[PDB]
Write a protein that binds this DNA or RNA. Structure first.
Lengths: 227, 129, 82, 107, 120, 218
RNA sequence: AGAUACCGCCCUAGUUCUAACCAUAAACGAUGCCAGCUAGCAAUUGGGUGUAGCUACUUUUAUGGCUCUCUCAGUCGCUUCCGGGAAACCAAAGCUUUUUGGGCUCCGGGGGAAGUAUGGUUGCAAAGCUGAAACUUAAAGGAAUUGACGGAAGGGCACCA
RNA sequence: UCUGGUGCCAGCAGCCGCGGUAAUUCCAGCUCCAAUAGCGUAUAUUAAAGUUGUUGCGGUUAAAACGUUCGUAGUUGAACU
């Protein structure tokens, strides 16, 4: 579904195209930026569904007199634990949608889900209680026990089915009638799921393999060589 | 003035680990607070601390790892029986996987996992996870 | 996060800092993984495998990653003579 | 909102401080909330000075200087353009600049 | 009264720094005529605006050339540059004139505990 | 051990003013100062730089592709030692401007993906070091005893103000980076004398003829 | 046009001092007090202690002045947090974790009607400390952004100046 | 974004808002959607309400630190067996 295959302009986009790595989490393990959007729809994209949230107009006062940029909020998500928001203003509503999907496909972050008191059968919701702010709106996330279907407003209802989480209790402080700043306040919580130092992660680790230095003089070539 | 030694040596721990120091100086080490760290020492969170013995009140120079997230005190020391011990683990601790609420039960200073098997109740002394 | 038959099946294991053990997030774009190799005793004959240190962004953004390698290097045998 | 961390100026550990009178306006503005100009001026313009040093009997008679201090209302120092309407990042600069010229305001 | 050649005359003014450094000289009427073969000017009377500049270009070049251009010899005089003064080293060789206390630095730091000297 | 103090090039430390620093001591950097004399000046521990120059030698090597290891000095006093770090190595030199984002942009054709910057003085050009924490790249640096040590590792405390100082251990960092997988047969005295790596002149002061000639005729 | 105003003249109560009353100010840092912690950088107020650092001269010393170096209590200043906040911004206005917890006290609950009416109390008075409702209302407000580009300063332009 | 009617009218609308001879909001026709032997309206009350705050708010500028300090009742009080 290329339909025309595109050149890797960045470094590790070539390694993706070279087949140097088949692990999307290997990018997440060393926290190096996915910079071009053609990276992840090679790794993912098999009917990976997204839906627009919020395309309400945004104006600016000029001399003759008021011109509109339509700002879009799109939300893309893997149902096995990846998430993204799209934030892009444009001229008209078609390129507002399509322009943010690239931004949605670049902000894709893994989701840590887990257990609460019972280590039985496909880790479900959240390992702990997390929250995240952006502009007065905080959203704590509570690990709900099994089969306790989503307890949130419709803006993180459609967002947390896209996150690989079974169920949730949530308690959203703030002005959540701003339907775009509500969505971005959930992500600072879910991005903290791989930032909470549980005692599940107190061993040292195999330290990583350094994908630069491990695949170094196989990039001493000057060619953009694929398979 | 210091209406708690336990607050003025647990925020002093917690303020010095969010900056990531490796040693905290606490003052002035009531034997209430030594057996609070000894609960935290034997669950990994705290290194082997040292009590400098000046004959005024004491000082401790407490080593630590960096596994701590929020190690505060509850005040005032609410008397908690055994049947309402889980209303104070639900709304306080992050998940029932880990974390502790430390109690001063009738036997000693202990956490909420050892007290619910030994079947003791007491006052809430603080919390750490 | 374990299950019945003892399994890390979350998605992966994130790195942790070498001198503070803070977890490096998925979007910590200021995370250094330096690689340092020692020598055969006098000078030369460079081995393979690096005595690798890793440091998150918040230690650099406060700025003591300079010293944070220096006394890692004392115990590990990288650098003596201070 | 609080446009300055100073407010006026120097009102710390005083409570309340003495006022002086403006020159052009004759207000009663604080001593510290005051555009002050310790004006040093030559008496004889230094361009008609050769007319006067002609008439000097003595060793060309080096000329005395005029000395005053110009306590200013703020609304009457903006009006006389001792100070003006800075930018919000240029608002924060106090000591720069001297850095202009030889002796100004004489002329 | 422009007082510099104003609009977009660097279509030719920075292609003659290396691609046409030679093939012209200081004469204005020579490089009036060499411009017609190097680029297809489709309407010509732009030609002398993009020819008359060399009177200002080569004059600015031959004495104290200004930023942003290469002539293949402006620091290919680096081949005639590497002066090796004998013998640029510690000429006093130990050295004696030092910060008047740093001998005791190099007592503890250093075995080389040679002759010293101090000035305040 | 012959990573030792090595007296054969410690006498050059004493002439090129590498044992002095600013009156600003910079609270992140008092393990590097040995003493503060009169005149407010700081005699820095250049012996502590000895382990750090060998650490700077160890830091560049073990990277198997030495093309994406960058040396930078934006301020013009060190813009000659940066250029002749490439006549030894595969390292790309950059002097002058950067066009930010020199790393954090992909539409442009001037972007680079390096792995370890080597900045001569960080307070002069931390504006690409601020770009050097969006793409997970360490910044080794030479530092005076006043330096903003945000994002940098490892700082090296010599002098970083005089032209003889920055000229000296830029060659010495170029020395042991070619003693480390460069194999010059065990530190044989170089064909390149101690300051070909040097700032040519206070341009343009006293400068006689080429090839180091004196004044024979009157 | 008007001018019980601004501007100009002599002036009265007042400003002045005493002995009482009054008890309010944008009485402001629009930021209660004691306590612990958390960072840089530079200045200064006060005290202490090593500088044969200088240095005035009874002879150098005793002192005084400063010099850098410390040290207490700070107060200013500026820079950004692993800070926080809606922002403006603030070493506190942070440590208010993942509804948190050192202690104590006061005050607010959309806007008006209103600090009114009324009662009580204080006062020589002016007035002060207390202090509602009826009815009305879908907004009032805060910090910021773009235009508006006016006794707003700056830098420029034109015979529709 | 159905069809006729009316034309800041008649009226509708909890609030925002509609209506001024093309009305997606009125009045009717043709349809449609919710719950269904049900459902609509009025008053009260609980949740919503992190807008009463023990859990759990706010008080530099949005409503809010007494002008100031003493001070009893009260509330809180260093370590030590």
């Amino acid at each position: 579904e290329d339909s025309k295959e595109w050149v890797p302009v960045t470094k590790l986009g070539r390694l993706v195209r070279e087949g140097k790595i088949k692990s999307l989490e290997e990018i997440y393990l060393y926290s190096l930026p996915i910079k071009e959007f053609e990276i992840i729809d090679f790794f993912l994209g098999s009917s990976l569904k997204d839906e627009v949230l919020k395309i309400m107009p945004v104006q600016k006062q000029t001399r003759a007199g008021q011109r509109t940029r339509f700002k879009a909020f799109v939300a893309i998500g893997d149902n096995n634990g990846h998430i993204g928001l799209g934030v892009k203003c444009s001229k008209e509503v078609a390129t507002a949608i399509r322009g943010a999907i690239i931004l949605a496909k670049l902000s894709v972050v893994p989701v840590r889900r887990g257990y609460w008191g019972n280590k039985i059968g496909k880790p479900h919701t959240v390992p702990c209680k997390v929250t995240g702010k952006c502009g007065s709106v905080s959203v704590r996330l509570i690990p709900a026990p099994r089969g306790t279907g989503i307890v949130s407003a419709p803006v993180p209802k459609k967002l947390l089915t896209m996150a690989g989480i079974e169920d949730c209790y949530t308690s959203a402080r703030g002005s959540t009638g701003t339907l775009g700043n509500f969505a971005k306040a959930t992500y600072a919580a879910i991005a903290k799921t791989y930032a909470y130092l549980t005692p599940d992660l107190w061993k040292e680790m195999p330290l990583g393999s350094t994908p630069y230095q491990a695949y170094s003089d196989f990039l001493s070539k000057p060619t953009p060589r694929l398979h | 003035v210091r209406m708690n030694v336990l607050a003025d040596a647990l925020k002093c721990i917690n303020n010095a680990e969010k900056r990531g120091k490796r040693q905290v100086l606490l003052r002035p080490c009531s034997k209430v607070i030594i057996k609070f760290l000894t609960v935290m020492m034997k669950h990994g969170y705290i290194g082997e601390f040292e009590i400098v013995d000046d004959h005024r009140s004491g000082k401790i120079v407490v080593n630590l790892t960096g596994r701590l997230n929020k190690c505060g005190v509850i005040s005032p020391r609410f008397d908690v029986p055994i049947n309402d011990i889980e209303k104070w683990t639900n709304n306080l601790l992050p998940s029932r996987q880990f974390g502790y609420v430390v109690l001063t039960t009738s036997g000693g200073i202990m956490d909420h996992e050892e007290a619910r098997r030994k079947h003791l109740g007491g006052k809430i002394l603080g919390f750490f996870f | 996060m374990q299950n019945d038959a003892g399994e890390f099946v979350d998605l992966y294991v994130p790195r942790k800092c070498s001198a503070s053990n803070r977890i490096i997030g998925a979007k910590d774009h200021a995370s250094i993984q330096m690689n340092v190799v020692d020598v055969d005793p006098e000078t030369g004959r460079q081995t393979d495998g690096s005595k690798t240190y890793a440091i998150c962004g918040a230690i650099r953004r406060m700025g003591e990653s300079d010293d944070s390698i220096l006394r890692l290097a004392k115990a590990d045998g990288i650098v003596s003579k201070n | 909102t609080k446009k300055r961390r100073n407010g006026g100026r120097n009102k710390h550990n005083r409570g309340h401080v003495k006022p002086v009178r403006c020159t052009n306006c004759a207000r009663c503005v604080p001593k510290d909330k005051a555009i002050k100009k310790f004006v040093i001026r030559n008496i004889v313009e230094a361009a008609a000075v050769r007319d006067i040093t002609e008439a000097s009997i003595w060793d060309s008679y080096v000329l005395p200087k005029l000395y005053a201090k110009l306590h200013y209302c703020v609304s009457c120092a903006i009006h006389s353009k001792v100070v003006r309407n800075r930018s919000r990042e240029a608002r924060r600069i106090r000591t720069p600049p001297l850095r202009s010229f030889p002796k100004d305001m004489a002329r | 009264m422009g007082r510099v050649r104003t609009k977009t005359v660097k279509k030719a003014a920075k292609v003659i720094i290396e691609k046409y450094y030679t093939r012209l000289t200081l004469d204005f009427h020579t490089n009036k005529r060499i411009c017609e073969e190097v680029a297809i000017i489709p309407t010509k009377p732009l030609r002398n605006k993009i020819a008359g500049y060399v009177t200002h270009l080569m004059g600015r070049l031959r004495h104290s050339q200004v930023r942003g251009i290469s002539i293949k010899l402006q620091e290919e005089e680096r081949e005639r540059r590497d002066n090796y003064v004998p013998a640029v080293s510690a000429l006093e060789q130990d050295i004696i004139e030092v910060d008047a206390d740093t001998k005791e630095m190099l007592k503890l730091l250093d075995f080389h505990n040679i002759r010293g000297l101090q000035l305040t | 051990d012959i990573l030792s103090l090595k007296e054969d090039d410690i006498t050059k430390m004493l002439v090129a003013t590498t044992h002095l620093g600013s009156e600003n001591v910079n609270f992140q950097m008092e393990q590097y100062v040995y003493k503060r004399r009169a005149d407010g000046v700081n005699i820095l521990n250049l012996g502590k730089t000895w382990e750090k120059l060998q650490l700077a030698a160890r830091a560049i090597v073990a990277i198997d592709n030495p093309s994406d290891i960058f040396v930078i000095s934006s301020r013009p006093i060190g813009q000659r030692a940066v250029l002749k770090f490439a006549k030894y190595t595969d390292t790309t030199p950059i002097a002058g401007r950067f066009t930010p984002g020199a790393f954090t942009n992909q539409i442009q054709p001037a972007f680079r993906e390096p792995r370890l910057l080597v900045v001569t003085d960080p307070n002069t050009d931390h504006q690409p070091i601020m770009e050097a924490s969006y793409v997970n790249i360490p910044v080794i640096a030479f530092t005076n005893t006043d330096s903003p040590l945000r994002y940098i590792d490892i700082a090296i405390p010599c002098n970083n103000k005089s032209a003889h100082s920055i000229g000296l251990m830029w060659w010495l960092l170029a020395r042991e980076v070619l003693r480390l997988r460069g194999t010059i047969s065990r530190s044989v005295e170089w064909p390149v004398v101690v300051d070909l790596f040097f700032y040519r002149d206070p341009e343009e002061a006293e400068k006689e003829e080429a090839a180091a000639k004196e004044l024979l005729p009157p």
